[PDB]
Write a protein that binds this DNA or RNA. Structure first.
Ligand code: MG
Length: 673
DNA sequence: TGAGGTAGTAGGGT
RNA sequence: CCUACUACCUC
């Protein structure tokens, strides 16, 4: 059925409906010299849009502006990664822009963004950075300070009305010159900024160069930039590249959490949701005060409390860790090997037992083996592994002191090559460090292929598969996928074959390889699948996949999941509740999969039903439950549903180790967690 | 390498 | 929007 109904506020504020003049922006035409180049045209126009000044943005192969064509710089010259271009703008009249047409709507909103940006630029006595305005001094420290404000946004809606988005944020500013910053003691400025203006850079190094040798220190003097400041050492900055000689005294370090890391105290940049809601309401009211588009009106929305997930081990469990005592769901016979990289010998008693306590409490048996080779023994080590694999060892638990990145990846790849997933557990280890080692054991077992916990319930889709791209914007250069159920997890790696196969073939490739591995492990071929992707890549990339599912007669649902851009969700009454579903413009909605502390504010996932007929609540419900099926955590659930959280980790590990043909590892052994 | 969350910054004329 | 890292917490 369905439960709960609640009302919430979105960190959005409704404003004045667009007036006739805005709905029909002026349409300018751009002429370049020399011609751009097939791929350089779009960004080049964006650049002319800025160069021409005013509330002007790119619309198609030209600009669209809200500023009178007369105030814009109709001619000029701009450079791009070398070549410079002369531009010409020809008013081509006015063009209505239907808000109902997402695509045209995309331009009015772009203009709304430029309009909002323009007001901040003329704001007095407030630090501005893009669409963020910082209006209050929060924390402090030697030479540095922290400002508080909000990242802002403005866009036109379905209805054709303005929308203001406000999300509180903190900014880190240095109040000390690079010369004085180094004096103190601090080191590396990744980027830096002119003490006199705002152009940020990426200082390369400090050159032991020429006092005043035309002139460097004179140039900065031919402007007074240097009067009463003491240009220090020769510093070569950078831009997105010429070496632009400079003085470390006319530069200000751009700090990160690091610089201010070691600190003048603990530093909490997170906000409990009420304080967060409080500042949003306030700043929204403050900006609307000088935006002149009416009073911002908090948009409310209907929310629904989704039914909690029934996480089942052998008995009922509240989190994965608890199955170590209750027993796991179904459990195979298994064997694990211990590999000690320090100087100790066997299995730590409390570990031996915990495993023993977990397995006995479960059905089947376990055997603990101990490898007696050392990675350095080379070939003797490999035969030792081949030999462990022979007697049935399924996964290796590695006790060792913290390992350097590359040593770590070398040991894992080496073991993986002999068909052995491994789990590292850092050796200075006490029995009281319950969380750390119990988590390690959860991983080891998962790597062994054991289904520690499963979902007890009913779901539209029998198989759920998450996809992640090998090239960030497309599956052109391969990628990975993972699938959860019965519910037994498995990974899928692309068909090894190189270059640029067609994207949709790579995708369909992933899905068919997943549909197969499922069958050879469940003996059955799912009747309905839930497909999950990130939204980063097009969608037409899943076309071959979709109708392939058409021929085999299996039903589907394509749902995209965004980690951010979901804004914020606050109740009108009561406390933030877990398992919150919030419908928006349709085919899309919000989901609050977690809320686990009160020193922070939850970040809703934003989803889009891009294909399929299953009802949105039904989608929300399942995607929420998939969230409790990650095996490697045990003390806290991920925000992303298991399938996507797993695939990303798989894509990460693939790159970190150097996987091509993981040929001896079973597909239900989550070697990558 | 224990791992999850919320956050801030790097990153996609001199 | 995505990644990366970092900090801060939490189990
Ligand atoms: Mg792991």
């Amino acid at each position: 059925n369905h439960l709960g109904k609640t009302e919430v506020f979105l960190n959005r504020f409704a404003l004045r409906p667009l007036n006739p003049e805005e709905l029909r922006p002026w349409r300018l035409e751009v002429v370049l010299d020399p011609p751009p180049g097939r791929e350089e045209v779009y960004p080049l126009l964006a650049q002319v849009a800025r160069r021409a000044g005013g509330v002007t943005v790119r619309m198609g192969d030209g600009l669209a502006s809200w500023s009178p064509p007369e105030v814009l710089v109709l001619e000029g010259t701009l450079a791009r990664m070398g070549q410079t271009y002369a531009y010409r703008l020809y008013p081509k009249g006015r063009r209505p822009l239907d808000p109902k047409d997402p695509g045209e709507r995309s331009v009015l909103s772009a203009l709304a963004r430029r309009l909002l940006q323009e007001r901040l630029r003329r704001l007095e006595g407030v630090w501005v950075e893009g669409l963020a305005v910082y209006r209050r001094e929060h924390a402090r420290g030697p030479g540095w300070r922290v400002l508080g404000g909000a990242v802002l946004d403005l866009w036109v809606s379905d209805s054709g009305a303005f929308l203001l988005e406000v999300d509180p944020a903190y900014r880190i500013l240095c109040e000390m010159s690079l010369e004085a910053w180094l004096a103190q003691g601090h080191p590396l400025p990744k980027r830096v900024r002119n003490a006199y203006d705002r152009r940020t850079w990426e200082l390369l190094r400090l050159g032991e160069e020429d006092p005043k040798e035309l002139s460097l220190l004179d140039y900065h003097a031919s402007k007074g930039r240097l009067q009463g400041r003491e240009g220090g050492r020769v510093a070569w900055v950078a831009d997105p590249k010429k070496p632009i000689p400079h003085l470390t005294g006319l530069l200000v370090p751009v700090l990160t959490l690091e610089d201010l890391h070691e600190e003048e105290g603990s530093l909490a940049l997170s906000l409990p949701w009420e304080e967060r809601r409080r500042r949003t309401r306030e700043i929204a009211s403050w900006i609307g005060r000088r935006l002149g588009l009416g009073t911002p009106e908090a948009v409310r929305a209907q929310a629904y409390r989704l039914s909690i997930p029934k996480l089942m081990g052998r008995r009922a469990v509240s989190k994965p860790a608890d199955a170590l005592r209750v027993g796991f769901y179904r459990a195979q016979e298994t064997a694990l090997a211990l590999l000690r990289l320090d100087g100790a010998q066997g299995w730590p008693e409390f570990l031996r037992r915990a495993l023993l306590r977990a397995f006995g409490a479960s059905g089947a048996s376990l055997r603990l083996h101990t490898l007696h080779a050392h990675p350095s023994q080379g070939l003797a080590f490999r035969e030792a592994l081949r030999k462990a694999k022979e007697e049935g060892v399924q996964a290796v638990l590695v006790l060792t002191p913290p390992m350097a990145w590359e040593d770590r990846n070398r040991l894992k790849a080496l073991l993986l090559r002999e068909g052995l997933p491994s789990q590292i557990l850092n050796v200075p280890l006490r029995e009281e460090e319950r969380h750390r080692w119990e988590n390690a054991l959860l991983g080891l077992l998962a790597k062994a292929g054991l289904q520690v916990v499963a979902l007890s319930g009913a779901y539209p889709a029998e198989l759920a598969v998450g996809f992640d791209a090998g090239g960030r914007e497309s599956f052109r250069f391969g990628g990975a996928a993972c699938a959860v159920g019965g519910g037994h997890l498995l990974w899928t790696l692309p068909e090894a074959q190189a270059g640029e196969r067609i994207p949709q073939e790579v995708v369909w490739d992933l899905l068919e390889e997943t549909l197969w591995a499922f069958r050879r492990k469940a003996g059955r071929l799912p009747s309905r699948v839930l497909l999950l992707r990130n939204g980063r890549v097009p969608q037409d990339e899943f076309a071959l996949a979709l109708e392939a599912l058409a021929r085999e007669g299996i039903a589907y649902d394509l749902v995209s999941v965004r980690k951010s851009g979901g804004g914020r969700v606050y109740p009108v009454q009561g406390r933030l509740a877990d398992g919150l579903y919030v419908p928006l413009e349709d085919k899309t909605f919000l989901l609050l999969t977690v809320h686990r502390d009160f020193r922070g504010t939850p970040r809703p996932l934003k989803l889009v039903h891009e294909a399929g007929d299953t009802p949105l609540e039904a989608l929300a419900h399942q995607i929420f439950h998939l969230t409790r099926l990650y095996p490697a955590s045990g003390f806290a659930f991920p925000r992303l549903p298991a399938p996507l959280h797993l695939a990303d980790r798989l894509v990460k590990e693939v790159g970190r180790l150097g996987i091509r043909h993981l040929k001896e590892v079973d597909r239900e052994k989550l070697f990558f967690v």
